[PDB]
Amino acid sequence: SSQIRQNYSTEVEAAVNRLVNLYLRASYTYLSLGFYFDRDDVALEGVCHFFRELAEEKREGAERLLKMQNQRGGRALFQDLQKPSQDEWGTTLDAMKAAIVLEKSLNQALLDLHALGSAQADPHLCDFLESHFLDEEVKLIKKMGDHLTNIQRLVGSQAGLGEYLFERLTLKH
Amino acid sequence: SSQIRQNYSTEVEAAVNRLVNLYLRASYTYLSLGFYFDRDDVALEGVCHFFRELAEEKREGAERLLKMQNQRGGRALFQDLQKPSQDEWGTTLDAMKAAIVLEKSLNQALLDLHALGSAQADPHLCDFLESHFLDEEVKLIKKMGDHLTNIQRLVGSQAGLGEYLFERLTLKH
Amino acid sequence: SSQIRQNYSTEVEAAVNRLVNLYLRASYTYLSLGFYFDRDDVALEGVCHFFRELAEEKREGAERLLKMQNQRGGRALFQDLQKPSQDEWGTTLDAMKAAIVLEKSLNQALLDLHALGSAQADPHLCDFLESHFLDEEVKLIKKMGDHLTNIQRLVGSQAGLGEYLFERLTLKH
Amino acid sequence: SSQIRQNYSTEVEAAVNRLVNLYLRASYTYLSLGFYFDRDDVALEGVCHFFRELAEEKREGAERLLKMQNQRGGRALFQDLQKPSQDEWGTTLDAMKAAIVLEKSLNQALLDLHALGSAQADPHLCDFLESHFLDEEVKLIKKMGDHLTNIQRLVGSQAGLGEYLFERLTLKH
Numbered sequence: 007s008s009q010i011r012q013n014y015s016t017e018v019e020a021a022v023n024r025l026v027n028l029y030l031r032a033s034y035t036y037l038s039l040g041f042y043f044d045r046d047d048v049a050l051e052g053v054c055h056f057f058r059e060l061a062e063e064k065r066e067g068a069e070r071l072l073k074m075q076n077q078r079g080g081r082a083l084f085q086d087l088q089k090p091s092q093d094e095w096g097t098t099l100d101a102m103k104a105a106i107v108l109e110k111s112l113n114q115a116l117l118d119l120h121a122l123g124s125a126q127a128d129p130h131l132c133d134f135l136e137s138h139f140l141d142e143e144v145k146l147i148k149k150m151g152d153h154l155t156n157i158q159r160l161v162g163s164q165a166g167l168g169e170y171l172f173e174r175l176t177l178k179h
Numbered sequence: 180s181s182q183i184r185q186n187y188s189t190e191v192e193a194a195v196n197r198l199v200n201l202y203l204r205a206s207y208t209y210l211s212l213g214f215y216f217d218r219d220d221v222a223l224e225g226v227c228h229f230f231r232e233l234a235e236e237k238r239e240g241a242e243r244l245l246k247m248q249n250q251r252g253g254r255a256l257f258q259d260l261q262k263p264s265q266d267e268w269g270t271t272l273d274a275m276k277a278a279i280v281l282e283k284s285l286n287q288a289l290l291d292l293h294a295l296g297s298a299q300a301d302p303h304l305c306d307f308l309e310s311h312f313l314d315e316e317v318k319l320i321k322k323m324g325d326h327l328t329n330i331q332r333l334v335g336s337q338a339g340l341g342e343y344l345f346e347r348l349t350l351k352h
Numbered sequence: 353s354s355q356i357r358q359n360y361s362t363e364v365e366a367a368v369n370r371l372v373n374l375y376l377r378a379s380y381t382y383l384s385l386g387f388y389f390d391r392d393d394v395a396l397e398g399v400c401h402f403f404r405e406l407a408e409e410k411r412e413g414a415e416r417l418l419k420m421q422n423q424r425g426g427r428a429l430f431q432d433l434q435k436p437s438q439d440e441w442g443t444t445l446d447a448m449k450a451a452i453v454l455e456k457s458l459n460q461a462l463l464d465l466h467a468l469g470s471a472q473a474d475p476h477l478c479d480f481l482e483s484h485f486l487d488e489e490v491k492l493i494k495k496m497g498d499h500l501t502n503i504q505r506l507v508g509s510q511a512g513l514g515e516y517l518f519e520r521l522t523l524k525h
Numbered sequence: 526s527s528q529i530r531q532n533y534s535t536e537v538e539a540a541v542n543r544l545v546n547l548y549l550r551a552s553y554t555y556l557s558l559g560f561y562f563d564r565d566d567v568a569l570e571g572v573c574h575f576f577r578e579l580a581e582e583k584r585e586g587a588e589r590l591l592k593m594q595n596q597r598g599g600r601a602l603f604q605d606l607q608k609p610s611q612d613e614w615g616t617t618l619d620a621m622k623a624a625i626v627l628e629k630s631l632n633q634a635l636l637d638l639h640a641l642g643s644a645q646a647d648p649h650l651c652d653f654l655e656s657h658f659l660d661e662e663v664k665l666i667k668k669m670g671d672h673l674t675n676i677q678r679l680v681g682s683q684a685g686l687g688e689y690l691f692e693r694l695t696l697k698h
């Protein structure tokens with residue numbers, strides 16, 4: 007048992023374990039999205055790389071949460087990772103909408119955990135979130151919003167042409 | 180009071196202060212334009228950077244005018260900066276039209292100040308304008324004209340597609 | 353309209369727009385102060401450079417606020433910038449007192465916005481302020497306080513001599 | 526006789542020769558000022574170097590005028606250089622006042638020559654003046670004005686102390 011734990015409620019410990027699960031699950035979802043865009047009959051490499059990079063970022067988020075849990079003398083508990091919600095992700099637009107939906111749910115979970123730590127007078131937790139998650143998430147959501155607007159602008163009359171141009175001219179590949 | 184002032188009429192001094200206000204006001208207008216194009220629901224980074232760069236150029240124009248005013252033994256007097264004329268700037272085309280309108284008004288103010296200095300036999304003023312403002316403004320207006328033509332060429336049938344391509348392929352980002 | 357906005361109250365959005373105006377207005381005030389010290393009949397270059405550097409810092413503060421507003425899915429709204437409170441700023445001492453007064457008002461506005469975001473459970477806002485404004489402002493106010501003390505120490509019997517020495521030996525030029 | 530002269534009036538040619546004399550005479554005056562400040566019983570090296578640098582600048586001004594006269598197919602005619610107006614130049618303040626008086630007379634001569642060339646429709650002359658003399662002179666006069674203000678600020682109660690500090694802390698040496 008921990009000899010270090012101090013000011014670290016059971017409620018926060020549990021919610022941290024839940025948030026780890028949410029991040030690993032987001033990572034899995036992004037792995038599925040990335041490989042869908044690598045299919046021969048989809049073949050949008052920039053979209054593929056964007057989601058693969060997100061899978062790695064979400065995994066790193068979970069790892070940092072796990073490190074913190076141990077730093078505080080909490081105990082990591084893992085649950086099943088639920089499979090992603092779809093086997094096929096539709097167009098780049100459907101996918102980017104899905105990604106924003108997912109990020110908004112992770113953001114609300116961060117905000118909920120922050121409100122918990124504030125209620126429990128756990129400033130270390132609040133600052134950990136502030137310093138490594140809250141702004142990173144706002145920045146990512148703004149970027150997705152930006153992309154979504156550009157994707158939408160491009161559907162207009164010839165969706166295929168728009169979808170190709172977005173991937174070629176905005177996304178990194 | 181100044182021990183240096185020589186051949187520097189009260190009329191030119193006042194018109195210099197007015198032109199400072201016009202440049203600061205142009206800078207403000209460009210700041211608003213730039214941030215409008217950074218909105219998540221507009222999201223045209225090259226257009227954003229173009230206007231932000233203009234805001235900085237207009238501010239530098241005002242600073243040079245202020246430096247000159249002091250060099251001549253004139254006294255800087257500042258007025259309120261009126262807010263920009265619009266809160267939302269429409270399409271890239273609407274914005275570039277607005278920018279050309281603004282630049283033509285600044286250019287006419289330079290020309291009016293030049294005619295004043297010529298009437299007052301103030302060759303230092305005339306040369307200051309010639310050397311740092313008149314050609315810079317002609318060059319900028321030609322560039323905006325060029326852009327406007329390309330934007331217009333691209334509206335044709337699918338305005339969204341045109342607007343994306345212009346920002347991606349002409350504007351710096 | 354924004355597809356990204358989350359946990360971002362109308363009250364904070366409006367107060368952010370107000371704070372942008374306050375920073376731009378502080379920038380303008382500093383521009384006037386800087387050019388007053390560049391007058392031939394004032395001629396204190398270190399004081400000039402100190403205020404000019406502040407004008408740039410305040411402008412950068414506003415730009416960061418504007419960036420954040422967009423990151424959150426808020427809408428930038430600009431008002432008139434009121435002219436600075438004085439056309440002539442007196443001695444270096446009068447000017448530094450004026451600057452501290454101005455900074456204290458900006459600091460109280462930051463603190464008021466922080467209390468709002470805390471009341472609205474907006475930790476991203478609170479952390480943005482904490483991370484880019486609150487300490488920067490405390491540090492600047494301490495520096496102005498330090499200067500003011502040294503200026504005051506130097507007025508004693510021969511104010512002109514003191515004013516020259518401060519500018520030559522403390523301020524950067 | 527010249528095979529190149531074109532649009533170059535006898536009036537401008539003569540006034541150019543006069544202005545050469547005025548610049549050489551200013552150079553001589555500055556040579557006397559510089560050596561006065563190198564006297565063992567004056568001994569203000571920064572003041573000495575400031576005037577010596579001005580003597581060289583005024584000489585270079587004359588040389589450029591002479592080059593131009595030949596470029597235009599005019600004929601250089603030299604007159605006596607009148608000795609400087611004083612054998613002893615008083616305090617740094619007296620000297621800097623004298624220097625500003627001299628520069629204002631040279632500036633008015635430039636302005637008078639410019640008005641002549643404008644009346645004679647001689648744009649090459651007007652531009653030569655604009656490009657190499659008018660702004661250089663405005664800049665120099667502003668610098669002298671700045672110095673004079675600082676010198677004046679420092680006389681106050683202990684003139685010797687002020688005079689030493691100005692030379693040590695403003696002037697280059």
Ligand SMILES: [Ru+3]
Binds near residue numbers: 132475
């Ligand atoms: Ru907190």
Ligand SMILES: [Ru+3]
Binds near residue numbers: 137
């Ligand atoms: Ru850390």
Ligand SMILES: [Ru+3]
Binds near residue numbers: 305306
């Ligand atoms: Ru002219």
Ligand SMILES: [Ru+3]
Binds near residue numbers: 660
């Ligand atoms: Ru110049």
Ligand SMILES: [Ru+3]
Binds near residue numbers: 466470479
């Ligand atoms: Ru807080």
Ligand SMILES: [Ru+3]
Binds near residue numbers: 483
């Ligand atoms: Ru940041």
Ligand SMILES: [Ru+3]
Binds near residue numbers: 639643651
């Ligand atoms: Ru001319």
Ligand SMILES: [Ru+3]
Binds near residue numbers: 656
């Ligand atoms: Ru030349």
